[PDB]
A = this chain, B = another copy of it.
Amino acid sequence: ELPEDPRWELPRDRLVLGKPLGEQVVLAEAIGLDKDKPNRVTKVAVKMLKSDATEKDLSDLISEMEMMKMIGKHKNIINLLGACTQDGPLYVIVEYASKGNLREYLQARRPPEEQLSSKDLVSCAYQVARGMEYLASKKCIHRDLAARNVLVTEDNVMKIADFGIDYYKKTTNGRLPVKWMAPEALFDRIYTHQSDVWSFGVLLWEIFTLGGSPYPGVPVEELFKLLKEGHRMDKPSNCTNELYMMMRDCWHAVPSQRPTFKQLVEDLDRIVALTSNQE
């Protein structure tokens, strides 16, 4: 049996499980998630263990939930809304983002859903930096910050997910997560907020290429050689010299010299206000 936390506990008859969202996370409807409004349904995402899970997988899911409780609420992160911990499988209830991951969102909006202006792209970057600055302020290190791990809501709000290793392992889309990793995290296994800033630099590149794949055709061994040579990704087209300078600053060889998330948030705030929405 699991211990019961009344702040977060939702009765099981208040949760209507729906279609799976991805491979497990399912779409669901929560009845009266808020105690003050018991007659309203909220579309939510529910994370649960599969039938083949072990006692280690359960402790991992519990730890993720406990971590989300400690971190607290922020507009630019996927927030915890509740849990079903008693008399049945553990359900971790989180915010639902209907427009999917940021990579897919940007790809679907490439020129021939709707079209994104230059100001909208800088706004995505600002929102992600904002969420990262909050997570860093809570002493949290992400370790896999990428566009695939950023979710977009119905109201186009950016929300960071999975915040709370074999180099040759590939993702579902067939990409290599090492391509987002700072050299000190890759070669010395040193993970800091500065190593996440390097990953944010790769994320900025993904935004301004509208869901572009980093280093296409490059295997792990060749990437290690590019990083050792001090190779850096090329300036995307439809990217200012100022935004490319930001990416390059995030990719400083010396971690202490990279900008912080606080600086990135301030710079991005000023750039948004100066960026045209007319193209």
Contact = CB atoms under 8 A, between A and B. Distances in A.
Interface residues of A, number: 18
Contacts of A34: none
Nearest to A222: B217
A259 interface: no
A138 to B, nearest CB: 36
Interface in A201-246: 209, 212, 215-219, 222-223, 225-226, 231, 234-237, 239, 244
Contact of A212 (B218, B223, B234, B239): B234
Q: In terms of DSSP, what is the predominant structure of the interface of chain A?
A: loop
A217 B229 CA distance: 11
Contacts of A231: 216-217
How many copies of the polypeptide does the oligomer hold?
2
Nearest to A239: B237
A225 B217 contact: yes
A112 to B, nearest CB: 13
Contacts of A239: 237
Give the top 7 A-B pairs by smallest Cβ distance, nearest first: A217-B222, A217-B218, A235-B237, A217-B226, A237-B237, A218-B218, A215-B217
Nearest to A227: B217
Contacts of A223: 217
A209 B222 contact: no
Contact of A234 (B217, B222, B237, B244): B237
Given A215-B217, A217-B222, 7 more contacts: A212-B234, A217-B217, A217-B226, A218-B218, A234-B237, A235-B237, A236-B237
Contacts of A237: 234-237, 239, 244
A183 to B, nearest CB: 15
Contact of A222 (B218, B226, B244): B218
A218 B236 CA distance: 19
A236 B237 CA distance: 6
Which one of A235, A239, A244 has the greatest number of beta carbons of chain B within 10 Å?
A: A235
17 contacts: A209-B234, A212-B234, A215-B217, A216-B226, A216-B231, A217-B219, A217-B223, A217-B225, A217-B226, A217-B231, A219-B222, A234-B236, A234-B237, A235-B237, A236-B237, A237-B237, A237-B244
